[PDB]
Amino acid sequence: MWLGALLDTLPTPALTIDRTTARRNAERMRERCRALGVRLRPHVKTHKTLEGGLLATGGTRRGIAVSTLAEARFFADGGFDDILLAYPVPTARLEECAGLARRLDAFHVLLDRPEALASLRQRPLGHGKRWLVWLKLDCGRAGVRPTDPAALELAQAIANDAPEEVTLVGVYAHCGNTYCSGADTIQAIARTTTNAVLSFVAALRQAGVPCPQASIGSTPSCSHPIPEMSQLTELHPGNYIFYDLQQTQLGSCQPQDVAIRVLTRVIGHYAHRGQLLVDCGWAALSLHGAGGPQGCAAIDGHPELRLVGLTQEHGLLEHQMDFGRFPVGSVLALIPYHACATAAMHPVYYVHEEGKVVALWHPVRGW
Amino acid sequence: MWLGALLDTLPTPALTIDRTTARRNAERMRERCRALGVRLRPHVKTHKTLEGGLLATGGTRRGIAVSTLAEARFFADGGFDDILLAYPVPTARLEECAGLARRLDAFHVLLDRPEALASLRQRPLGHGKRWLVWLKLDCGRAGVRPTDPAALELAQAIANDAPEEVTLVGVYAHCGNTYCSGADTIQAIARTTTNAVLSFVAALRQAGVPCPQASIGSTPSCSHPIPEMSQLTELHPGNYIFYDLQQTQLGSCQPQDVAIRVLTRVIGHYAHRGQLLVDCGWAALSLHGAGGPQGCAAIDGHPELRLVGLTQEHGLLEHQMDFGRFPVGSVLALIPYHACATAAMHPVYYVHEEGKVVALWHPVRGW
Numbered sequence: 001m002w003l004g005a006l007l008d009t010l011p012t013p014a015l016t017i018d019r020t021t022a023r024r025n026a027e028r029m030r031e032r033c034r035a036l037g038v039r040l041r042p043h044v045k046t047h048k049t050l051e052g053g054l055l056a057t058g059g060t061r062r063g064i065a066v067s068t069l070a071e072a073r074f075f076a077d078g079g080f081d082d083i084l085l086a087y088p089v090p091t092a093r094l095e096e097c098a099g100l101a102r103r104l105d106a107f108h109v110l111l112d113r114p115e116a117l118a119s120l121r122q123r124p125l126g127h128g129k130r131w132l133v134w135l136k137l138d139c140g141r142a143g144v145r146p147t148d149p150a151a152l153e154l155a156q157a158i159a160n161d162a163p164e165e166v167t168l169v170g171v172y173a174h175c176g177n178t179y180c181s182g183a184d185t186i187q188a189i190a191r192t193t194t195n196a197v198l199s200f201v202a203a204l205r206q207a208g209v210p211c212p213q214a215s216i217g218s219t220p221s222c223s224h225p226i227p228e229m230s231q232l233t234e235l236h237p238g239n240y241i242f243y244d245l246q247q248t249q250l251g252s253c254q255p256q257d258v259a260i261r262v263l264t265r266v267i268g269h270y271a272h273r274g275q276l277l278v279d280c281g282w283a284a285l286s287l288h289g290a291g292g293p294q295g296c297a298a299i300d301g302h303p304e305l306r307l308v309g310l311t312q313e314h315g316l317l318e319h320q321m322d323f324g325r326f327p328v329g330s331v332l333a334l335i336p337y338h339a340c341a342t343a344a345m346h347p348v349y350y351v352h353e354e355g356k357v358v359a360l361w362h363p364v365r366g367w
Numbered sequence: 368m369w370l371g372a373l374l375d376t377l378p379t380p381a382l383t384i385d386r387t388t389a390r391r392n393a394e395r396m397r398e399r400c401r402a403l404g405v406r407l408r409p410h411v412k413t414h415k416t417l418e419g420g421l422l423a424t425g426g427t428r429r430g431i432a433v434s435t436l437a438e439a440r441f442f443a444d445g446g447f448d449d450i451l452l453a454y455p456v457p458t459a460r461l462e463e464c465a466g467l468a469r470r471l472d473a474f475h476v477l478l479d480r481p482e483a484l485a486s487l488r489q490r491p492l493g494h495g496k497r498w499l500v501w502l503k504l505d506c507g508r509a510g511v512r513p514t515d516p517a518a519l520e521l522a523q524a525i526a527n528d529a530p531e532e533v534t535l536v537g538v539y540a541h542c543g544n545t546y547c548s549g550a551d552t553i554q555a556i557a558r559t560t561t562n563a564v565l566s567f568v569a570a571l572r573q574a575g576v577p578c579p580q581a582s583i584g585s586t587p588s589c590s591h592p593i594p595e596m597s598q599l600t601e602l603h604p605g606n607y608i609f610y611d612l613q614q615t616q617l618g619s620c621q622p623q624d625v626a627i628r629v630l631t632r633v634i635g636h637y638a639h640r641g642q643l644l645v646d647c648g649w650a651a652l653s654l655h656g657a658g659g660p661q662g663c664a665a666i667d668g669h670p671e672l673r674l675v676g677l678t679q680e681h682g683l684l685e686h687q688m689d690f691g692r693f694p695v696g697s698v699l700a701l702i703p704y705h706a707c708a709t710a711a712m713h714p715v716y717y718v719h720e721e722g723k724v725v726a727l728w729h730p731v732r733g734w
C-alpha cells in the first residue's frame with residue numbers, strides 16, 4: 001500500500017497517472033459530447049480498470065466499449081452495464097457472449113458478416129432477450145463498406161429477419177485511420193467517416209431499415225470534433241483519458257493533457273559511452289513508437305535526453321551528457337508513445353494528485 | 368481449467384508451450400553444461416514461471432538468475448534458492464534485497480560501480496550473512512570493462528575490503544551482443560567474451576583477488592558452445608527453454624526446437640483486400656520483430672501467409688489468398704519473434720503434450 005507516498009518514493013519503473021489530468025480529460029470529453037448533443041461511450045482498452053471506467057463514465061458505470069471478453073466480464077463483475085463488445089463477435093465464444101447478454105440489461109455485439117448473424121441465430125439467447133447487434137462499418141480493418149450493397153442487405157437481415165431473436169441497435173465505425181498528423185487531416189478522416197455513416201443510415205431509412213443509433217470515434221477525431229458529428233447518436237473514443245506522446249505529436253492534445261508517465265530511476269552512469277542507465281526496459285514500456293527506441297518515449301522536462309536503447313529491464317539515455325544533473329538514484333518521468341500499449345505492461349497504476357499517491361488501479365488483462 | 372483439452376479448443380489468442388519440446392530444451396542445455404564441466408544457472412526471464420524454473424533446473428529448484436525483485440520474491444516464495452539477481456543491484460531497494468538475502472541460503476547480487484558497493488556497506492545484512500556479490504563485466508550495456516584498471520580495483524574492494532560484510536563470488540558477463548547471425552559470429556562474440564573474462568580472472572589471481580566463479584552466457588552462445596567455456600564455472604542462458612523465430616533466424620536452433628506458439632483464430636475474410644483477420648493483436652504478441660509487422664511472427668506450416676498488420680486485438684494476414692484453405696474459425700499457430708516479449712503479454716501459458724493441455728503455467732510480472 002502506497003497511499004500518501006511521494007512519487008519519487010515509488011518502486012521503479014512505475015506507471016503513474018495524474019488523477020487531476022485524467023479527471024479533466026474525462027470531463028472534457030463528456031462536455032464535448034454534451035455540446036454536440038451525443039452520448040459518450042468511452043472505450044476502456046487504454047486502461048482496462050474499473051476506476052478509469054468510473055471516471056470516463058462520469059460515475060454512472062453505464063455505457064462503455066471493451067476490446068475483449070476478459071474486459072466485458074471484468075466490467076460486468078464490477079457492476080457496469082450497457083457494455084459493447086467492440087469487436088467482430090467471437091462466434092467460437094458465443095456461449096460466453098450469451099452468458100453476458102443474459103446477466104446484463106444491455107450487452108452489445110458487433111458484426112460484419114452474414115455467417116456471424118447465422119451463428120447468432122443458431123445460438124438464441126432465450127430468456128426474453130435479443131442479441132443487440134451493431135453493424136460494423138468500414139469507412140480499413142474490419143466491417144462492411146457502406147457502399148457495398150452487401151452492407152445494406154446485412155443491415156436489413158440483422159434488423160428484420162428475426163426480430164424476436166436479434167435486433168439492429170445501430171451502425172458502428174472506428175476511424176482508426178486518423179493515426180496522419182494535424183487537425184485538418186484528422187478532421188477530414190472524421191468527415192469522410194461521419195458522412196459515409198450518415199449516408200448509410202439515410203440509405204437504411206429509405207430502405208425502411210430501422211437503425212436507431214450511429215457511433216463513431218477515435219481519440220484524434222473526438223479531441224477536435226466537427227459539427228457533422230452532432231447528427232450521430234454516440235462517440236466512442238478511449239485513449240483520451242490518458243493521452244500519450246503519439247497523440248501529442250498528432251496534435252490531438254497538448255503535453256499538459258498527458259496523464260500517464262513511466263517513472264524510472266537512473267541506475268548507472270557509463271561515461272565511456274556518454275549514457276545514463278535507467279531501470280525502465282521494454283517490459284515496462286513496450287516497443288511502441290520504435291517502428292528506433294528514441295521514438296518510444298520522451299523524458300518529461302528534459303528535451304536534451306533521448307532513449308537510444310531498451311532491453312527487457314534496462315534503458316539507455318543519451319544527451320555530451322551532464323552526469324551531475326542526473327545522479328544515480330534520481331527519478332525521471334518517461335512520457336510513453338502509446339498509452340494503451342504501455343498500460344498493458346503494468347499490473348498496477350499509481351494514481352496521484354499534488355505529488356502524492358491517492359489510489360492504486362489494477363487493470364484486467366488476457367482474453 | 369483446461370487440462371485434457373485439445374489445442375483447437377482453447378480460447379484464442381492463446382500462448383501454448385509444447386512441454387515435450389520445452390523439457391527437451393531444458394535437458395539439452397543441462398547436458399551441454401555437464402559435457403563442458405560447468406554448472407547451469409538458467410535465467411528465468413523468458414517464462415517467469417515456477418514450472419519453467421523447475422524444468423530448467425532439472426527438478427532441483429536451485430540455481431537461477433532473475434531480472435527483477437518481483438521474480439526473486441516469486442521464486443523464493445516458490446521454494447527456490449541460489450537465486451542471482453542478474454541486474455545492477457537496486458540501491459534504492461536495498462531493504463528488499465537484504466530481506467531476500469536473509470531468507471535465502473544464497474541470494475546473489477551484481478554490481479559494477481564503487482558507489483553501489485558503498486551502498487551495500489552502509490546497509491549491512493547482519494545475521495551472520497554476507498552480501499554475495501558478482502562483479503558485472505562489460506566485454507555493451509552494464510558492467511565494467513575488464514581492461515579498465517577500475518575493474519580490477521573494484522573486484523579487489525568487493526573481495527577484501529570488508530570480508531565480514533561482503534564477498535566476491537565471481538565475475539558475470541552477458542554476451543547480449545550475440546543478438547549478428549550465424550554460428551561463426553556468435554561463437555566469435557562468445558570467444559571474445561570468454562577470453563576477456565578468463566583474462567580478467569587470471570589478472571585477479573595474479574593480484575591475489577579471490578574469484579571462485581565465472582559466469583557467462585546468452586542463448587545463442589550456449590546453443591553452440593565453444594571449448595573455452597569449460598574454463599568457466601557456470602553458464603546462464605534462459606531463452607533456450609522456449610526459443611523463438613529470432614533464435615531460429617540467428618541459427619541458434621531449428622524450427623523444431625521452438626516450444627512456444629500463439630494460437631489465433633481466423634475471425635474474418637476480407638476479399639476486397641485479400642486479407643484474413645485473426646484474433647491475435649499486439650496485446651497477445653508484442654511488436655518485437657517489427658523494427659514491419661511481418662517480422663513479428665511466422666505462421667507455422669504456412670510460409671504463404673504473412674502478418675501485414677497488428678492492432679491491439681486484431682491481426683491481418685495476407686498470402687492471392689485462398690479463403691477455403693482457412694475457414695473462419697480455423698486455428699493457426701503463430702511463431703513469435705521474441706519469446707521473452709510474447710510471454711510477457713500472457714497471464715497463462717497452455718502447456719501441452721500430444722495435442723492436449725497438460726498444465727497451465729502462470730507467470731509473475733511487475734517489479
Ligand SMILES: *Cc1c(COP(=O)(O)O)cnc(C)c1O
Pocket residue numbers: 043045065067086087173174217218219220236237238239240
Ligand atoms: C480503440 C477503439 C476505440 C477507441 O479509439 P481510440 O482512438 O484509441 O480512443 C473505438 N472503437 C474501437 C473498435 C477501438 O478498437
Ligand SMILES: *Cc1c(COP(=O)(O)O)cnc(C)c1O
Pocket residue numbers: 410412432434453454540541584585586587603604605606607
Ligand atoms: C537475459 C539475460 C540472460 C539470459 O540470456 P538469453 O540470451 O536471453 O538466454 C543472462 N544474463 C542477463 C543479465 C540477462 O539479462
Ligand SMILES: [Cl-]
Pocket residue numbers: 286287288653654655
Ligand atoms: Cl512491444
Ligand SMILES: [Zn+2]
Pocket residue numbers: 239338339340341
Ligand atoms: Zn491505442
Ligand SMILES: [Zn+2]
Pocket residue numbers: 606705706707708
Ligand atoms: Zn529475450
